[PDB]
Amino acid sequence: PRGLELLIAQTILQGFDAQYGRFLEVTSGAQQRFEQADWHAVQQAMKNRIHLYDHHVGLVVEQLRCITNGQSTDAEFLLRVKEHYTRLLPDYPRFEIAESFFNSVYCRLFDHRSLTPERLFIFSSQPERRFRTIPRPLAKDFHPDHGWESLLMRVISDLPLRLHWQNKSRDIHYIIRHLTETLGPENLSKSHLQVANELFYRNKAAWLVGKLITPSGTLPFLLPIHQTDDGELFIDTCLTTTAEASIVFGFARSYFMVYAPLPAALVEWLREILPGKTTAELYMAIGCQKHAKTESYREYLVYLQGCNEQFIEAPGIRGMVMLVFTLPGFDRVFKVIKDKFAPQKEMSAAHVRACYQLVKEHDRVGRMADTQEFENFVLEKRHISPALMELLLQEAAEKITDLGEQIVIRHLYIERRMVPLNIWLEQVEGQQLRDAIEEYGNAIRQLAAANIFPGDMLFKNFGVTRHGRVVFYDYDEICYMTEVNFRDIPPPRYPPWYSVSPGDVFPEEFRHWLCADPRIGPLFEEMHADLFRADYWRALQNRIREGHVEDVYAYRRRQRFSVRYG
Ligand SMILES: Nc1ncnc2c1ncn2[C@@H]1O[C@H](COP(=O)(O)OP(=O)(O)OP(=O)(O)O)[C@@H](O)[C@H]1O
Ligand SMILES: Nc1ncnc2c1ncn2[C@@H]1O[C@H](COP(=O)(O)O)[C@@H](O)[C@H]1O
Ligand SMILES: [Mg+2]
């Protein structure tokens, strides 16, 4: 009886302990991967780290099964287990993530249905932290008592990175000028530094994240440590702006790889810098993706209970395969695969689902948005707008089940809500339009350089962020770059003896679409003409196959030290 309820509760908790343990054993390898520039490893780590959590929830559920099987499928029994599990939390440093794990297990057990607040931690059970004193620092303070050249030499001479610096003084002085031109000699000496103990690794970079304490108030202080074609460590640029920081930790970049024995602590410190990020967003930034899903559902529930607006179909051009809706004042959209696709389409829901999975664990490169897959998402009929309820019933009838006052959508994705780039290009003008086309062209370029070929490059498949960045979001259109045949001469039209086969792509036909509006055409020819040349694309897939891995700067290129300062 009791003993069993306890074993279960404890095997679930032992499960979380083990998964987080494994999770950071992986993370700790980031330094070595970067130190030996093993770029291909860095990416496999991103995939293995992402699967860990589900792997363990898997093991734990199997155990839970053998351990009983008869009771696992029993809601009365699990009510007790939750009871005990909850009494094990007051101790655990990572209790919040411990709750998510319990939920994950609960869900696998009941195939994601009947999720009441009494059966799982949809809410928390624990009092809000509101931090005391971290058991151990997590960040060090640096005062310029001879500082700036001394302060910096001291911090640069603290990184555990085992490679040679290709002229520190050089980089160290670049940093000084920036601060100087930014704070003014006076306050620069009134201001100090507080840099996090751990480096945030991502791709071919090792990030330093600290706080610039100005008498004006605290500010972001980030230094992207890069490495030369032959192992030289150098600091490329320095960002002390909140907006800048928001991009570096943007939702369209792969999560950072930062060693964090106590996540909640790290998250809270982070709020200071980039204060526009919500709780889930901060977790997601440092890698706790599954836990952020838990927090996302909470922020959703909060916003929902506090608004008298109904769910309506997302603004823009309706799609051939997905049905996407949103709440007026909410910063996300829901996307569901439609029962049947438009005649012009010949792919399976399975393939669509595969693409979303493909990009989730991909080097998102800052151009593809993170998404959250939800099984059996529940909505309250009285919340769905009449126009939308009929769309769902007509387009996704198979994916929705009635429950009287509420409906259940079986599968769906949730992602950052942006404004469809096709709408932006019709709202913006002048400089703002140039910035969009450049931003758009560079999106294609970077996706391409990371073995991702957008399927349909039409504006309607891209979105514009709060910062005016163009991010791709129509994932089932995608295919790997080393999997498409680029061609020079386009097939005749007379708007087929000229045989074209699956995989063929004619970069010159792009002119026709991407340049039909006289407003933007010229802008393309000026900033992105290369995109119409099949030679350009083939060169790109050559470096891919050659195993090359292009660099990505989470900032404007004209901010790189080697650009502005000589
Ligand atoms: N992240 C988003 N933010 C804002 N609107 C979005 C977002 N994602 C999709 N939409 C809305 O839905 C439309 C895009 O639907 P979408 O392109 O994703 O279906 P689909 O992707 O075309 O099917 P397929 O992938 O096979 O091309 C846009 O018109 C846009 O208004
Ligand atoms: N259908 C759902 N409705 C509401 N929350 C969910 C749903 N599915 C999963 N979650 C939440 O997301 C976390 C589980 O993610 P997962 O393990 O992939 O099922 C849990 O902490 C749950 O609170
Ligand atoms: Mg589309």
DSSP per residue over 442-469, as a string? HHHHHHHHTTEE-S---GGGEEE-TT--
CB of 319 closer than 6 A to ligand 1?
Answer: yes
Find out whether 460 and 425 touch, Cβ atoms under 8 Å: no
The position carrying tokens 């003084």 is 169
Question: Pocket of ligand 1, candidates 474, 477, 478, 479: which has the most ligand atoms within 8 Å of its Cβ, to mutate?
Answer: 474
Residue 168, token pair as written in the block? 């520190």
Helical ranges in 338-481 per DSSP H: 349-360, 386-395, 421-427, 431-449
Ligand-binding annotation for 314, yes or no, is yes
- Integer angstrom CA distances of residue 56 from 16, 30, 467: 8, 22, 37
3-state secondary structure of 487: coil
Buried b (16+ CB within 10 A) or exposed e, 298-330: bbbeeeeeeeeebbbbbeeeebebbbbbbbeeb
**Cβ-contact 311, 383 below 8 angstroms:** yes
Q: Could you tell me which of 473, 288, 277, 279 has the C-alpha nearest to residue 367?
A: 473
Tokens of 252: 């369209």
274-278 long-range Cβ contacts below 8 angstroms, 24+ apart: 274/220, 274/242, 274/245, 274/246, 274/249, 275/242, 276/242, 276/246, 277/246, 277/249
Q: Is the dihedral of CA 103, 333, 252, 502 positive or negative?
A: positive
If you compute the radius of gyration of the chain from its CA atoms, what whole number of angstroms results?
25
| CA dihedral sign, ordered 375, 378, 381, 384 | negative
Q: How many DSSP H helices and E strands does the chain contain? A: 20, 20
Q: Are 178 and 171 in contact (CB under 8 A)?
A: no
| DSSP labels, 231-271 | SEEEE---B--HHHHHHHT-TTSPPPB---SSHHHHHHHHH
Query: Is 273 known to sit in a ligand binding site?
Result: no
CB 557, CB 231: distance < 8 Å: no
Distance CA 260, CA 274 (A): 18
- State the alpha helices, DSSP H only, in 260-329: 263-272, 279-286, 289-305
The count of residues in the chain is 566
Between the alpha carbon of residue 159 and those of residues 196, 208, 237, 304, 501, the distances in Å are: 11, 9, 17, 45, 53
Mark the breaks in the chain: residue after which each occurs, C to N over 2.5 Å: 495
Kindly give the distance from the C-alpha atom of residue 337 to the centroid of ligand 1, in angstroms, as a whole number.
11
Hey, is 343 helix, strand or coil? coil
d(CA 279, CA 297): 11
Mind telling me the catalytic residues? 370
Q: Tokens 């502005």, residue?
A: 564
By CB atoms closer than 10 A (0-12, 13-18, 19+), residue 17 is middle
Is residue 288 within 8 Å of 280, Cβ to Cβ?
no
Q: From atom 12 of ligand 1, which residue's Cα is the shortest distance away? A: 324
Q: Which atom of ligand 1 is nearest to the CA of 422?
A: 29
CB distance 359 to ligand 1 below 6 Å: no
Task: Please indicate whether residue 144, judged by its CB atom, sits closer than 6 Å to ligand 1.
Answer: no
Q: Resolution to 1 decimal, in Å?
A: 2.8
How far is 557 from 237, CA to CA, in rounded Å? 9
Calpha distance 67→60 (Å, rounded): 10
Distance CA 176, CA 152 (A): 9
395 ligand 1 Cβ < 6 A = no
CA distance linking residue 424 with residue 433, whole number of Å:
9
Between CA 182 and CA 214 the distance in angstroms is: 11
HSE, side-chain direction, 13 A CA sphere, residue 221: 24
Residue ranges around ligand 2 (CB below 6 Å): 57, 100, 103-104, 107, 112, 115, 122, 290, 293-294, 297, 374-377
112 backbone φψ class: left, alpha, beta (φ>0; ψ -120 to 50) = left
> How many whole angstroms separate alpha carbon 527 and alpha carbon 548?
24
The span from the CA of 520 to the CA of 421, in Å, is 13
157: CB partners within 8 A, 6+ apart: none
Contacts of 16 (CB under 8 A, 6+ apart): 56, 94, 97, 98, 101, 102
CA dihedral (133, 136, 139, 145) positive or negative: positive
Tokens of 225: 């440590």
Strands 164-165 and 452-453: unpaired
Q: Please name the method used to determine this structure.
A: X-ray
Distance CA 33, CA 203 (A): 10
Distance CA 24, CA 18 (A): 10
Contact 254, 46 (CB under 8 A): yes
Q: What's the N-to-C CA distance of the chain in angstroms? A: 74
Per-domain residue ranges for the chain? 1-566
Using the mean position of ligand 2's atoms as its centre, give its distance from the Cα of residue 370 in Å: 16
Residue 174 and residue 168: Cα distance in Å, rounded?
Answer: 10
Whether 78 contacts 85, CB under 8 Å: no
3-state DSSP assignment of residue 26? helix
Cα–ligand 1 centroid distance for 312 (angstroms): 14
Encoded tokens for 462: 């891209």
Beta-strand (E) ranges in 42-176? Answer: 139-142, 164-165
CB 244 within 8 A of CB 220: yes
Report DSSP state, residue 56.
H
Token look-up 């900033």 returns 527
The verdict on whether residue 400 carries a ligand-binding annotation is no
* Residue nearest to ligand 2 atom 2, measured at CA: 377
Distances (CA, A) of 274 to 128, 196, 218, 291: 21, 15, 11, 20
Map residue 144 onto helix, strand or coil.
coil
Between 2-27 and 75-86, two packed helices, what is the crossing angle to 10 degrees? 60
Q: Out of 55, 294, 370, 407, give the residue to mutate to test ligand 2, the one with the largest number of ligand atoms within 8 Å of its CB.
A: 294
Q: Which residues pair with 504 in a beta bridge?
A: 485
Does the Cβ of 320 fall within 6 Å of ligand 1?
A: yes
Ligand 1 lined by 210 (C-beta under 6 Å): no
Residue nearest to atom 15 of ligand 1 (CA): 319
Helices (H), 490-565: 509-514, 521-527, 534-545, 561-564
Q: Are 260 and 286 in contact (CB under 8 A)?
A: yes
Residue corresponding to tokens 């099987």? 69
- Decide: 477 in ligand 1 pocket, CB within 6 A: yes
Task: Write the DSSP symbol of residue 135.
Answer: S
